[PDB]
Amino acid sequence: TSAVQQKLAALEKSSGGRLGVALIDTADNTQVLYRGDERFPMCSTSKVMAAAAVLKQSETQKQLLNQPVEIKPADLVNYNPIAEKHVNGTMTLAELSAAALQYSDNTAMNKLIAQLGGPGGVTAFARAIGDETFRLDRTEPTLNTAIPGDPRDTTTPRAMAQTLRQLTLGHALGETQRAQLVTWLKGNTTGAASIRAGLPTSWTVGDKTGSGDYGTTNDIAVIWPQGRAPLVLVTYFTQPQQNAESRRDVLASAARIIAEGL
Ligand SMILES: [K+]
Ligand SMILES: [K+]
Ligand SMILES: [K+]
Ligand SMILES: [K+]
Numbered sequence: 001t002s003a004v005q006q007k008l009a010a011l012e013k014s015s016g017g018r019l020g021v022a023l024i025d026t027a028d029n030t031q032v033l034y035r036g037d038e039r040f041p042m043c044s045t046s047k048v049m050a051a052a053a054v055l056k057q058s059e060t061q062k063q064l065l066n067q068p069v070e071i072k073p074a075d076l077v078n079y080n081p082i083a084e085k086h087v088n089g090t091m092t093l094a095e096l097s098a099a100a101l102q103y104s105d106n107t108a109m110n111k112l113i114a115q116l117g118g119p120g121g122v123t124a125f126a127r128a129i130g131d132e133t134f135r136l137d138r139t140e141p142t143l144n145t146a147i148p149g150d151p152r153d154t155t156t157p158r159a160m161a162q163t164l165r166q167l168t169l170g171h172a173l174g175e176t177q178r179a180q181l182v183t184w185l186k187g188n189t190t191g192a193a194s195i196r197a198g199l200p201t202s203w204t205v206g207d208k209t210g211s212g213d214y215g216t217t218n219d220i221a222v223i224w225p226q227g228r229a230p231l232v233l234v235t236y237f238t239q240p241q242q243n244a245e246s247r248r249d250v251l252a253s254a255a256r257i258i259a260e261g262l
Contacts, residue, residue: 004261008034008254015250017215020236022157023258024165027229031158032258039154040236041146043210045218046122046136046153047100050112051184052167053125054093055177057115065094069115075107078141083107101184101208106140113139126163129172133159144212146238160220161234168206168222169230182206185222193248194219195233198255202226215244219251233258 001009012019012034020040023032058064068090071083082099083091084107091099091108093115100108116122119136126134136143137152145152166172168182185206194217196205203225210218216238223231235251 002032002261004032004257005034007257007261011250011253011257015237015239015247017237017239017244017247017250019250019254020157020234021254021258022161022232022234024161024232025229025262026165026169026231031161032261033158036158037156039151039156040218040238041144041150041212041214041216042134042136042153042155042160043144043146043212043216043218044104044106044109045160045208045210045220046134046143047104047109047112047210048164048167048181048185048208048220049126049134049136050109050116050122051097051101052173052177052181053116053122054097054112055173055181056125058093059174059177065097066092068092069096069111071107071111075110077106077110079104080107081105083111098184098187102188102190104190104209109140129163129166131155131159131163134163144216146212146214146216148214148238148240157234157236161232164220164222164234165232169232182222191219191221194251195221195223195235195255196252197248198252198257199223199259200225203259209248211246212238214242215239215247217247217251219248221255 021034096108099105122136134155143153191207207221
């Protein structure tokens with residue numbers, strides 16, 4: 001095993017949990033993986049798949065993103081920072097997409113799932129862009145249960161890194177759509193203590209975090225260093241105790257180990 005993998009294994013051992021990392025260097029298309037083929041609960045990182053599915057729809061329904069959407073009291077779930085600001089009012093699918101991606105709003109995610117026809121509509125878009133691994137089974141908030149061994153609402157680090165590459169740097173989306181997604185990921189408010197904290201401060205980053213039971217702490221990022229091809233980095237982490245605390249530091253340290261392995 002590589003030098004990087006030795007250091008990621010040691011980080012994992014010090015943490016008491018289970019760590020998953022996938023890097024894709026778009027220079028030589030080489031990959032670094034740690035438990036790259038194990039399943040991890042996605043938690044809110046699945047918001048990227050749902051927002052991207054809606055973007056794919058907007059390519060033919062050219063006014064879809066401005067479509068208003070009723071926010072009703074019964075739509076509110078466990079974590080609704082933006083949507084609770086509009087109960088008995090409306091929000092557009094663009095506003096819901098940005099609330100989901102940039103504030104991790106769970107009512108926003110549920111509206112995107114509805115627009116897609118249920119969780120199966122998210123999974124279907126994954127299958128349509130070549131991702132045979134991702135699976136979304138539940139809505140918010142039950143998709144966060146993160147039960148050990150449960151395959152519901154999981155993916156693997158390798159699959160999510162490949163997919164995130166296609167949506168953000170590839171052409172799985174149309175060009176207007178891809179840049180909307182990139183802008184959204186760059187304006188995330190929830191990621192300062194996760195991957196971003198382990199990286200050179202000059203690098204540009206867009207990311208989506210996730211957190212859930214079993215101290216599940218996740219981040220998926222696309223990374224633009226200065227002077228070299230961009231990278232995609234996925235870091236998943238989950239823990240043995242159902243009530244375990246968040247460990248965003250593990251993700252920052254994973255990113256540091258990866259960046260220093262370049
Ligand atoms: K093992
Ligand atoms: K969330
Ligand atoms: K699980
Ligand atoms: K938690």
